[PDB]
Structures are given as structure tokens and as C-alpha cells.
Amino acid sequence: QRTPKIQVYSRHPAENGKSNFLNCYVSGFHPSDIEVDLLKNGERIEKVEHSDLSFSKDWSFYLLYYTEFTPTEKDEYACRVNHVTLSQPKIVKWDRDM
Amino acid sequence: LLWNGPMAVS
């Protein structure tokens, strides 16, 4: 078993009011079963898609979860990940600088 | 194009 790494980021440098894509990239994990949600102000976003499962040279898996979003000043976005290696879900907040 | 030759079982 291997625990997931997580990066939460926008496809494009964010500007408020300009449609964009919110990405949660999970990688380095095994086994491949994993629960990933994108959150807006703590609530699950319904229209979330993901890439087809692939894997790296150490056999660990990676997936991109993504949805269209329009960033604003006050809305908080996050990625919530659960996996057998985690005692509880891990929540990573989106920071527009990273 | 995928490999066609028999996918030998382990």
C-alpha cells in the first residue's frame, strides 16, 4: 500500500469571474480504489470528471479529477480524498498561488 | 495497435 499525494490547482492562473477548471491530481497511491471529491464551501460538487487510471514506474497510480468553475473572492474550493491508507479523509484547500 | 499474439496466462 502507498498513500496518495495531492495537488489542488487551477488549469489557468485564476481571475475572479473568469471561468476556469479546478483540478485535483492524486498520485503515488496503491491500491487504485480511491474516493475523491471537489468541494465548494464544504459541499460536494456534482459535475466532477476524472481521467482514466494510469500508473508510474513504481506501479503507483495517478488520476486527475476536474470540473469547470468560476473562482470568486469569497468561495472556498478544496479536494477531499479518502483511501485505505488514511485513517480519515484528507482535505486540501485550493490556493490560487500554487 | 495492441499486441495480438496470445496473452499467455501466468
Binding site: 499525494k5 488549469r11 491500491p31 487510471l53 494510469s54 | 496473452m7 496466462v9 501466468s10
Partner: protein
């Protein structure tokens, strides 16, 4: 430059009910071009790049037949390997397979490979000579003896040196507009105050293809790794990739630091400086 065609396959057993989940992905270089997912509705190999959509029905029927054959082999193997390892029928387990071929700048065969893993660890792999097998343990040794008796390596070698390369070349030509285009990284630096005396400089590489890239920091012309952070290269979602590297510096000394960016799409490496 050089090119590759690679196929990736994952099967995950479902002891509670039903058959394994099976996901197959095909790539040319860092471009996904086909997929199969046992959970999807089509039950067909599906296109994922515009330049493969021109292939006719014989192609799609044949790729669907073959990918389903791969899936059945994996299903059988999950049962066989559970037995080799004296494991319970109650647990879920995983088989992963990756094979493919590389060509050089002249589009001639460079190397081929076929790797197989059980529960995320090496199980059996074709050696670079395309003749011999590397077995990680005694279960894989049993498999190696089976594959020697069935002369698997011979058939695989013929595919890797012939069909694999010939079809890679076909795809490279049909998809030339994108597959033969390099997208150099769009680079910039950001600056973040972290105290009266520290600042963070973050060097960005955006929208690049292929994914391979090197970002390095120097201070007064010498590589620096202390006080740096380099994130894993990550997909933008539009077929390109992103990466950044950051360094913490004493506020006011930013000009000593340079970020160096190497990528196939750059005739010369780029140097960025906060000025």
C-alpha cells in the same frame, strides 16, 4: 526527437460480487489516444485523440477484441496468483501490465518492454534483449517457466520490433499537427513575502508538452537545493503539463537567484531572474 507507444492495463478483483474492474489506456508519447473501461457503457475500445478517429471499423472491432482478450487473461491471472501466494478468496488484488516500444529521431526501433506487476510490486518483466524474463520471486519463476515453454518472448519481440513501431509511425504521421509539435513551457516568476526578512520565489513552467522538464535554482551561479521545493509535474487537463520550483531567500537578495528551465521545445535553456 524520440517517440514511444505504450499501453497500460489495470485489473482489480471484486471478491464481493462480479468480475474485476479493467482499465486500459494507450499513449503515443504523453498523449492518450485510446481507452477501454469495463465500467463504461460502450464495451468498446474508444478514441481519445482526433487523429485516431479516422481509423475504420476493422480497427475498432479488432482493438475491442484484443483489449477484451487482455482483460480475460488478467482475470485468469488474478485467480492463479491468489493461489500461488496462498491468499484468501475474500480480498481484492491487482494486476498491472505495461508494454510498448520506443523509436529514435529517425523513427527506427530503439527498445521495447513488457512489465507485469501483482499488488503493486514487480512480478515478471521482459529483459531489454527481448529474449529473457526477470522473475522477482518463486511465483513469478513458475510463470517464467510457463512463458518459456510457450515461447511468449518470441511473439512479443516480433510485435515490439515490428507492428508496434510500424503503427507508432502511422500515428505520428496521421497526428503530425500535435504529436510532432513541441510546446515550450511558458515561464514566469512570482514573489511572495513570508516575513520582514524572508521571501519565496516561485518559478513556473506552464502549458508544456511533452511532460519531461527540468527546473533548477542557482544562487550566484551555483546550483542550490537547500530551501527549495519542487512539485511533481502535473497535468493541466488540456493535454499539456505544469511544474513549479520555489526557493526561500533573504528579502532583498532576490537578484542573486536564477531559475533554469530545460525542455525539448527550447533550443536553449531559459534563465529567469527576479529583477
Amino acid at each position: 526527437g524520440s517517440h514511444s507507444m505504450r499501453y497500460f492495463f489495470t485489473s482489480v478483483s471484486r471478491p464481493g460480487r462480479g468480475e474485476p474492474r479493467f482499465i486500459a489506456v494507450g499513449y503515443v508519447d504523453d498523449t492518450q489516444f485510446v481507452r477501454f473501461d469495463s465500467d463504461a457503457a460502450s464495451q468498446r475500445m474508444e478514441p481519445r485523440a482526433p487523429w485516431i478517429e479516422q481509423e475504420g471499423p476493422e480497427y475498432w472491432d479488432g482493438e475491442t477484441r484484443k483489449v477484451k482478450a487482455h482483460s480475460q487473461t488478467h482475470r485468469v491471472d488474478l485467480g492463479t496468483l491468489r493461489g500461488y501466494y496462498n491468499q484468501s478468496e475474500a480480498g481484492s488484488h491487482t494486476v498491472q501490465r505495461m508494454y510498448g516500444c520506443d523509436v529514435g529521431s529517425d523513427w527506427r526501433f530503439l527498445r521495447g518492454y513488457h512489465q507485469y506487476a501483482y499488488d503493486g510490486k514487480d512480478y515478471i518483466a521482459l529483459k531489454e534483449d527481448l529474449r529473457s524474463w526477470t522473475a522477482a520471486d518463486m511465483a513469478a519463476q513458475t510463470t517464467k517457466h510457463k512463458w518459456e515453454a510457450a515461447h511468449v518472448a518470441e511473439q512479443l519481440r516480433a510485435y515490439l520490433e515490428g507492428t508496434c513501431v510500424e503503427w507508432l509511425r502511422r500515428y505520428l504521421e496521421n497526428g503530425k499537427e500535435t504529436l510532432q509539435r513541441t510546446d515550450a513551457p511558458k515561464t514566469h516568476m512570482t514573489h511572495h513575502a513570508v516575513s520582514d526578512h524572508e521571501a519565496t520565489l516561485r518559478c513556473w513552467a506552464l502549458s508544456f508538452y511533452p511532460a519531461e522538464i527540468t527546473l533548477t535554482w542557482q544562487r550566484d551561479g551555483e546550483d542550490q537545493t537547500q530551501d527549495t521545493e519542487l512539485v511533481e509535474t502535473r497535468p493541466a487537463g488540456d493535454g499539456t503539463f505544469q511544474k513549479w520550483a520555489a526557493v526561500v531567500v533573504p528579502s532583498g537578495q532576490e537578484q542573486r537567484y536564477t531559475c533554469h528551465v530545460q525542455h525539448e521545445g527550447l533550443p536553449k535553456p531559459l534563465t529567469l531572474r527576479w529583477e
